[PDB]
Subunit: 135 residues, 7 copies
């Protein structure tokens, strides 16, 4: 497994969810321009692993075929100890793509391959998010 | 199953519907929608080797689109717009086939899902005044 | 039949027409339409190895387009605009062939169908003042 | 005989013309047109291994375009703009070849035909003040 | 000949020029033009295995462009702008080669020719104050 | 060496830095920059098989970007914006890899370098308040 | 020679320069230019297996660009802007390599040359205050 850089702040409760992700969901707000909540289903598992309070007015879901990889990954975030995740654009190997939240401060173009989990911290909002892939 | 169920999105309201055939694939599908309420209201679905039209929800909407689908043609680009929550609704659908055919009906102002892809084999959900909830279904 | 029938779309009005030949395929097809009423009004259709012009509905409209079609050339992109309902009408047609040839006729302001694809072999429907109803037909 | 005749479009007026060679192909084509009247007025056509210019209609127009055509080069995109009816006229022509060459002449404000495609082998029609009527011609 | 002569376009005025070799192809070519008069005024042409610079017409124009041409590089996109008539002139030239090189010179406000294509092997025409008349020439 | 040193561009000011590892490559890089001063201010760099974060210059800037880089992924498109002269500075960087990944940081209003390409293996330069000077380094 | 000389363009002024090495190729190249005078003013050129910087003309200009060039990377798109005449000057340069790298320097307001393509092996010309005259040079 390959662990992307966790970006955003140091706040909120630790989460680590790690089969392959076969669905992912991003709750976000216009009022605060933050990611607030994430859920993640796995490949042969009905269980929904979730984190942070879904207090936001939009959500998007990306379903992901068994053979489909992420080729284009970007997380928007505010940098610093006092930080937060603000947005995410993902693009797959089949042209599928999702845009969530805002990109007004800092960015990371992450590592690419088959998305295998996420890790970070979450409270009111998503304090910190880093992706995980295969080789 | 020999089948992949997309996430049913929208609300928990209306009457359960499930359209599939023992060895059939969707060969045609229709979406009624309104400008006044920005909702999907009605759906119909024919299948291969079967004249029967399976329908659901009240077609009270002022537009409709139909996609016919060749026997060997797959869905490669699928998106459902919807309002999230227990008290939710479907608002729009874009489909794109494996032959460049594309239909786009509805509004996408709140929430989205980019679904799974393959040979469209049925739909599942709930419907009343409008389409409360919709999830697609594919082969392997 | 050795034939695939597109959904006839539009209303139930006007006189039934059906154009197909024992061993022809459509070689030419014309669409008359108006700006004043935003309707298809008239259609004509020549066939391979046959000089006869098969026509329907009154050509009262201020524009027309013709698509000529090579012997080996297929339809890959077919769309009919229409008003839905028992008291309905066809409003427009975009066709695209397998050589990049394409025609746009009339208006697409209410409802659409993306039809099935193959070698265009005839048309069927009803016509009066205007084209009440149109469905295409292909080989397999 | 070994030839495909596009539909002659436009009116029934002016003097008959038919330009073809026993085993030759058009190697150059010219279109005179006006801004004042938005008509094609004059055409000329040389053929392969033959310096003679076959011409028709009065060149009273303020623009002209010439398409030269390589020996192996085909027309893949052909369109004639025209006013429909017994009382009709040709208004414009777009041609596109198999090397990306293309020419645009005149106006397309009333009616169109997307013609048949292949190696252009002659033209036929009628011409007077202007080009009353034009149909193209191809090999197999 | 082993050669294909594009149509000389423009007027009948000025002194005859013909730039050719028994076995040579243009290696470079230059177009002088003015903004004041919107005409081509002067041309120069080197050839492969010949240090002679062949020129014609008075270079009284305020811009020039040069296209150098690799040994294996062909013209795939050739156009000459010109005023038609006995009393005529060349106004512009766009060339595009087989390596994406291209030059644009002068103006295209009246008439055009899309010429034949191949490896450019000379030019021929008439020139005085300006370039009265220009035609290109290719191999087979 | 086993390397290729791009040109260090910008000024001669600040403290010398050099980040390289004995048989390893940059696996991640970060650029801090400001809107207020239109400068690169700080850089950090992780390497393959090494948890250490090597950094330089004061991160007083209001934006940062990070590029992670797969083990087999190369830089194919590299550009550094900078103010030239003894009293100079780096103002921006665009990088593009062999997987379409790309990052933009800072401003490009004065001077540029399109660098050498291959596997990014370290950076070298000088830094103080800001990044006085930056040059990249690749594997031969 | 085993070398191809681009046409030197611009004026006849300034001191002759010629940069070439017995078996090497340009590995780097730099263009100083001004907004105040819209001229190229200075050029520098490193070569393969040689740290020496060969330069010419006074760098009095407010911008510079550098193109680094991989060992196997060729120029596929080369253009020099210049004022023509005995009293002439170079105003700009666009280069494009065989890896998508490209640089734009100075102004293209009067005259151009699209040069010969291959591996850049040196430059020659004249320079003073500014770059009076520049021609490129390639291998076979």
């Amino acid at each position: 497994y390959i662990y992307s850089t966790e970006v955003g702040g140091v706040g909120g409760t630790p989460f680590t969810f790690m089969g392959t992700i076969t669905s992912i969901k991003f709750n976000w707000s216009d009022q605060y321009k933050l990611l607030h909540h994430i859920e993640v289903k796995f490949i042969n598992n009905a269980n929904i692993y979730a984190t942070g309070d879904p207090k936001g007015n939009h959500e998007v879901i990306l379903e992901i075929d068994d053979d489909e990889t992420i080729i284009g990954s970007v997380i928007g975030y505010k940098k610093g100890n006092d930080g937060r995740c603000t947005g995410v654009k993902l693009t797959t190997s089949k042209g599928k793509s999702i845009m969530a939240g805002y990109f007004e401060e800092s960015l990371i173009t992450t590592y690419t391959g088959k998305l295998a989990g996420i890790k970070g911290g979450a409270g009111s909002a998503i304090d910190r998010l880093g992706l995980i892939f295969l080789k």
